[PDB]
């Protein structure tokens, strides 16, 4: 197994927030683009990164990849629900529950980035990341959309120094 397996698993699990968010934004007619990359969130992210002793620019790059992957899922869901509205989730999303999950996923990702900073800067990162993704894609039974979104979300993991 790869040492990035848990970091990638946390990222893949975090991508699934897209399903509740699209389900809510669909009914509420909210823009998918209004996703939170605002100065207050960027500063909080950087202050949380410095608190974990990891590079804020690196962490910001990771979450810039993550948000793009998340929006991409929401757009594909909107595409599916436009073609066949009946396939839309019947159940309302539990966003109070999702809020606490995201907080836990964020912390796990940041502590994992610190806990594996040496590997993320190493030449073996690329091979380790590829093995991690396949494990997570197999173990999480990720479909084509989530696989590609996981690739987008993790494409800067090995840009560490």
């Amino acid at each position: 197994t790869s040492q990035l397996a848990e970091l990638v698993d946390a990222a893949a699990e975090r991508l699934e927030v897209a399903d509740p968010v699209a389900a809510f934004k669909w009914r509420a007619q909210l823009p998918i683009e209004d996703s939170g990359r605002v100065e207050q969130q960027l500063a909080k992210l950087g202050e949380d990164a410095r608190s974990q002793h990891i590079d804020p620019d690196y962490v910001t790059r990771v979450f810039d990849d993550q948000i793009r992957a998340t929006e991409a899922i929401e757009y594909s869901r909107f595409s599916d629900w436009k073609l066949n509205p009946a396939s839309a989730p019947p159940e309302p999303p539990d966003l109070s529950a999702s809020r606490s999950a995201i907080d836990s996923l964020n912390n796990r990702m940041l502590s994992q980035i610190w806990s594996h900073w040496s590997l993320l800067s190493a030449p073996s990162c690329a091979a380790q990341l590829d093995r991690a993704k396949r494990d997570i894609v197999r173990s999480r039974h990720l479909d084509s959309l989530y696989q590609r979104a996981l690739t987008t979300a993790t494409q800067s993991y090995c840009q560490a120094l």
């Binding site: 927030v17 897209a18 968010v21 809510f24 934004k25 509420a28 909210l30 209004d34 996703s35 939170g36 990359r37 605002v38 969130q41 960027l42 909080k44 992210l45 949380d48 979450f63 948000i67 998340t70 966003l95 999702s98 809020r99 999950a101 995201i102 907080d103 964020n106």
Partner: peptide, 13 residues
Amino acid sequence: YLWTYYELIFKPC
């Protein structure tokens, strides 16, 4: 708005 960039933040409209 409903945000997912860093925190899942939710303001009622």
